[PDB]
Amino acid sequence: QYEDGKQYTTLEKPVAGAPQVLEFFSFFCAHAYQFEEVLHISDNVKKKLPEGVKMTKYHVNFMGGDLGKDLTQAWAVAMALGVEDKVTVPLFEGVQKTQTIRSASDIRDVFINAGIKGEEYDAAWNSFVVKSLVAQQEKAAADVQLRGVPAMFVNGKYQLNPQGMDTSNMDVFVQQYADTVKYLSEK
Numbered sequence: 001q002y003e004d005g006k007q008y009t010t011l012e013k014p015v016a017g018a019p020q021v022l023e024f025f026s027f028f029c030a031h032a033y034q035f036e037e038v039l040h041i042s043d044n045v046k047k048k049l050p051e052g053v054k055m056t057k058y059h060v061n062f063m064g065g066d067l068g069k070d071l072t073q074a075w076a077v078a079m080a081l082g083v084e085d086k087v088t089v090p091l092f093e094g095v096q097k098t099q100t101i102r103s104a105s106d107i108r109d110v111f112i113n114a115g116i117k118g119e120e121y122d123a124a125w126n127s128f129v130v131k132s133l134v135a136q137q138e139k140a141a142a143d144v145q146l147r148g149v150p151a152m153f154v155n156g157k158y159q160l161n162p163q164g165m166d167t168s169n170m171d172v173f174v175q176q177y178a179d180t181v182k183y184l185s186e187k
Contacts, residue, residue, distance in 0.1 A: 018156025076133030
Protein backbone atom coordinates (compact mmCIF):
# COMPACT_ATOMS: atom_id res chain seq x y z
CA GLN A 1 0.00 0.00 0.00
CA TYR A 2 2.69 2.56 1.01
CA GLU A 3 5.05 2.85 -1.98
CA ASP A 4 7.59 5.57 -2.86
CA GLY A 5 5.79 6.81 -5.95
CA LYS A 6 2.18 6.39 -4.84
CA GLN A 7 1.21 8.31 -1.67
CA TYR A 8 4.51 10.20 -1.88
CA THR A 9 7.94 10.37 -3.50
CA THR A 10 11.50 10.88 -2.24
CA LEU A 11 14.19 13.49 -2.85
CA GLU A 12 17.39 12.52 -4.70
CA LYS A 13 19.03 15.11 -2.45
CA PRO A 14 17.31 15.20 0.99
CA VAL A 15 17.54 18.58 2.76
CA ALA A 16 19.27 18.43 6.14
CA GLY A 17 17.97 20.29 9.17
CA ALA A 18 14.41 20.34 7.85
CA PRO A 19 11.24 20.62 9.90
CA GLN A 20 9.96 17.15 10.80
CA VAL A 21 6.83 18.13 8.78
CA LEU A 22 6.95 21.19 6.46
CA GLU A 23 3.94 22.53 4.62
CA PHE A 24 4.40 25.10 1.81
CA PHE A 25 1.62 27.49 0.91
CA SER A 26 0.88 30.86 -0.62
CA PHE A 27 -1.96 33.30 0.10
CA PHE A 28 -1.98 33.99 -3.60
CA CYS A 29 -3.05 30.51 -4.66
CA ALA A 30 -6.83 29.90 -4.30
CA HIS A 31 -6.11 26.14 -4.19
CA ALA A 32 -3.76 26.79 -1.27
CA TYR A 33 -6.82 28.25 0.46
CA GLN A 34 -8.86 25.03 0.33
CA PHE A 35 -5.96 23.13 1.89
CA GLU A 36 -6.81 24.54 5.31
CA GLU A 37 -10.19 26.24 5.10
CA VAL A 38 -12.10 23.44 3.42
CA LEU A 39 -9.72 20.47 3.75
CA HIS A 40 -8.17 21.66 7.01
CA ILE A 41 -5.49 19.13 6.09
CA SER A 42 -3.27 21.21 8.32
CA ASP A 43 -5.62 20.18 11.15
CA ASN A 44 -6.75 16.67 10.22
CA VAL A 45 -3.04 15.95 9.71
CA LYS A 46 -1.98 17.64 12.95
CA LYS A 47 -4.48 15.31 14.65
CA LYS A 48 -2.92 12.00 13.56
CA LEU A 49 0.60 13.31 14.04
CA PRO A 50 2.87 11.55 16.59
CA GLU A 51 2.95 13.22 20.05
CA GLY A 52 5.58 15.93 19.57
CA VAL A 53 5.52 16.39 15.80
CA LYS A 54 5.70 20.08 14.84
CA MET A 55 3.48 20.87 11.83
CA THR A 56 5.48 23.82 10.35
CA LYS A 57 4.06 25.94 7.47
CA TYR A 58 6.08 28.29 5.27
CA HIS A 59 4.78 30.92 2.88
CA VAL A 60 6.26 31.37 -0.61
CA ASN A 61 6.14 34.44 -2.82
CA PHE A 62 3.66 34.32 -5.71
CA MET A 63 4.57 36.71 -8.55
CA GLY A 64 7.32 38.57 -6.78
CA GLY A 65 5.69 41.93 -6.28
CA ASP A 66 6.34 43.76 -3.04
CA LEU A 67 3.08 42.36 -1.58
CA GLY A 68 4.17 38.73 -1.76
CA LYS A 69 7.48 39.62 -0.10
CA ASP A 70 5.54 41.49 2.64
CA LEU A 71 3.17 38.55 3.25
CA THR A 72 6.12 36.18 3.58
CA GLN A 73 7.53 38.59 6.10
CA ALA A 74 4.10 39.14 7.65
CA TRP A 75 3.89 35.37 7.97
CA ALA A 76 7.29 35.18 9.66
CA VAL A 77 5.88 37.76 12.13
CA ALA A 78 3.02 35.37 12.92
CA MET A 79 5.32 32.40 13.52
CA ALA A 80 7.26 34.97 15.49
CA LEU A 81 4.41 36.09 17.71
CA GLY A 82 3.01 32.53 17.59
CA VAL A 83 -0.24 34.04 16.25
CA GLU A 84 -0.35 31.81 13.16
CA ASP A 85 -3.69 30.40 14.20
CA LYS A 86 -5.33 33.81 14.62
CA VAL A 87 -4.24 35.60 11.44
CA THR A 88 -4.44 32.69 9.02
CA VAL A 89 -8.18 33.01 8.20
CA PRO A 90 -8.46 36.84 8.02
CA LEU A 91 -5.26 36.95 5.93
CA PHE A 92 -6.76 34.35 3.58
CA GLU A 93 -10.16 36.12 3.83
CA GLY A 94 -8.36 39.41 3.39
CA VAL A 95 -6.22 38.54 0.37
CA GLN A 96 -8.79 36.65 -1.71
CA LYS A 97 -12.34 36.82 -0.39
CA THR A 98 -12.86 40.42 0.81
CA GLN A 99 -9.71 41.30 -1.16
CA THR A 100 -8.88 44.24 1.10
CA ILE A 101 -5.16 43.52 1.49
CA ARG A 102 -3.26 45.56 -1.11
CA SER A 103 -0.37 46.87 0.99
CA ALA A 104 1.90 46.16 3.92
CA SER A 105 -0.36 48.43 5.97
CA ASP A 106 -3.53 46.44 5.29
CA ILE A 107 -1.60 43.38 6.48
CA ARG A 108 -0.73 45.35 9.57
CA ASP A 109 -4.41 46.15 10.03
CA VAL A 110 -5.51 42.48 9.77
CA PHE A 111 -2.97 41.72 12.53
CA ILE A 112 -4.54 44.31 14.83
CA ASN A 113 -8.16 43.12 14.42
CA ALA A 114 -6.76 39.80 15.60
CA GLY A 115 -5.52 41.13 18.93
CA ILE A 116 -1.98 42.16 18.04
CA LYS A 117 -0.97 45.61 19.20
CA GLY A 118 0.08 47.63 16.15
CA GLU A 119 3.15 48.33 18.30
CA GLU A 120 4.32 44.77 19.04
CA TYR A 121 3.78 44.01 15.36
CA ASP A 122 6.21 46.65 14.09
CA ALA A 123 8.49 45.46 16.84
CA ALA A 124 8.41 41.97 15.26
CA TRP A 125 8.20 43.17 11.68
CA ASN A 126 11.59 44.88 12.10
CA SER A 127 13.08 42.10 14.24
CA PHE A 128 16.05 39.83 13.51
CA VAL A 129 13.91 36.84 14.43
CA VAL A 130 11.57 37.63 11.57
CA LYS A 131 14.52 38.40 9.27
CA SER A 132 15.81 34.91 9.99
CA LEU A 133 12.31 33.50 9.71
CA VAL A 134 11.97 35.14 6.31
CA ALA A 135 15.40 33.84 5.28
CA GLN A 136 14.50 30.23 6.15
CA GLN A 137 11.18 30.14 4.32
CA GLU A 138 13.00 31.07 1.11
CA LYS A 139 15.88 28.72 1.84
CA ALA A 140 13.68 25.64 2.29
CA ALA A 141 11.60 26.17 -0.85
CA ALA A 142 15.00 26.44 -2.52
CA ASP A 143 16.35 23.23 -1.01
CA VAL A 144 13.33 21.15 -2.07
CA GLN A 145 13.27 22.79 -5.50
CA LEU A 146 9.61 23.52 -4.84
CA ARG A 147 7.53 23.21 -7.98
CA GLY A 148 4.07 24.20 -6.89
CA VAL A 149 1.87 24.92 -3.89
CA PRO A 150 0.38 23.90 -1.64
CA ALA A 151 2.89 21.14 -0.99
CA MET A 152 4.06 19.18 2.03
CA PHE A 153 7.38 17.52 2.85
CA VAL A 154 8.53 15.17 5.65
CA ASN A 155 11.90 14.96 7.47
CA GLY A 156 13.24 16.90 4.52
CA LYS A 157 13.24 13.59 2.55
CA TYR A 158 9.67 12.75 1.48
CA GLN A 159 7.16 14.76 -0.53
CA LEU A 160 3.50 13.92 -0.03
CA ASN A 161 1.78 13.36 -3.35
CA PRO A 162 -2.02 14.02 -2.99
CA GLN A 163 -2.89 13.08 -6.56
CA GLY A 164 -1.46 9.65 -5.85
CA MET A 165 -4.08 8.98 -3.20
CA ASP A 166 -7.74 7.87 -3.18
CA THR A 167 -9.77 10.94 -4.26
CA SER A 168 -13.25 9.45 -4.69
CA ASN A 169 -14.42 10.92 -1.42
CA MET A 170 -13.11 13.70 0.83
CA ASP A 171 -12.84 11.53 3.94
CA VAL A 172 -11.02 8.73 2.16
CA PHE A 173 -8.67 11.33 0.76
CA VAL A 174 -7.90 13.25 3.96
CA GLN A 175 -7.66 10.06 6.01
CA GLN A 176 -5.08 8.54 3.68
CA TYR A 177 -3.20 11.83 3.45
CA ALA A 178 -3.04 12.09 7.22
CA ASP A 179 -1.94 8.47 7.54
CA THR A 180 0.71 8.88 4.88
CA VAL A 181 2.27 11.80 6.77
CA LYS A 182 2.20 9.86 10.05
CA TYR A 183 3.85 6.80 8.44
CA LEU A 184 6.29 8.76 6.31
CA SER A 185 6.98 10.41 9.68
CA GLU A 186 8.62 7.26 11.08
CA LYS A 187 11.19 6.21 8.46
